[PDB]
Every structure is written in C-alpha cells, then in structure tokens.
Amino acid sequence: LSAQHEAELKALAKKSDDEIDYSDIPASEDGQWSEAVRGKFFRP
C-alpha cells in the first residue's frame, strides 16, 4: 500500500471502541452471531 493508505489503516486500528459510530450498523450480541458461517464468500 501507499504510505498514506497504510497510515489510514493503522489510525483505524488504534481507534477505541468509544470512537465507533453505530448509526449505520448497530452493535450486536454473541446470540445474533450464533448462526454465522465462517469462510461463506471465500473464493480461492
């Protein structure tokens, strides 16, 4: 990645949970993730 793109991702990695905005994708609970599939859309 460019240095600037990498920097954006490292800044995001350091964001605290307090700084997350749930207005478009609300917070979940473990129970809502009971029927999840891992690797569902993985294409090699």
Binding site: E8, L9, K15, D30, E35, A36, V37, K40, F42, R43
Partner: protein
Amino acid sequence: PMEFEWDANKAKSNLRKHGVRFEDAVLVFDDPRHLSRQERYENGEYRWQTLGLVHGIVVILVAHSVRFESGFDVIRIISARKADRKERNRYEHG
C-alpha cells in the same frame, strides 16, 4: 464467481463517517476466516454482515447484500465500520 458493486456517494459518506473505504471493505471476503451472518431478505436480495481482517491491520464489519445471477454472484457493499470488542471476539474465537 463474484463481483462487487456499491453507490459511489455511499462509499464517500462511509469513509467520512466511519473511516472505512469500500475498496478495503471488499477485502474482508479475501480473508479465509471472515465470519458472516444473514439478516433478512430486502428488495430481492439477502442482507448479510461479515467480519474480516483487512491488510493484516484491522478487523472491519461490512453490511452487504448478495444476489445470484446466471454464472456469477454480486455483492453490494452498503456500510462498513471498525469492529468493536464483542465483534472482534466472535471473529477470533467464534
């Protein structure tokens, strides 16, 4: 086979509000450990949420739809944000 679509204005707003690019949100599907849950049927497609690791640096949550066409699938990216503590816990240990 899979292709990706989104509204360009929604992508710009998502970057402004949440700090996540849709071009990076697409990369959750390249993480073999991505974790996906189906929410509802909406406007002729299934809405899903997927957690995955982007560029080895950050776990993101992606809201998207899936539609099946003749010989290919289309994922529409709708929203994306950093995963929180519970969501990271499901991504690592679910």
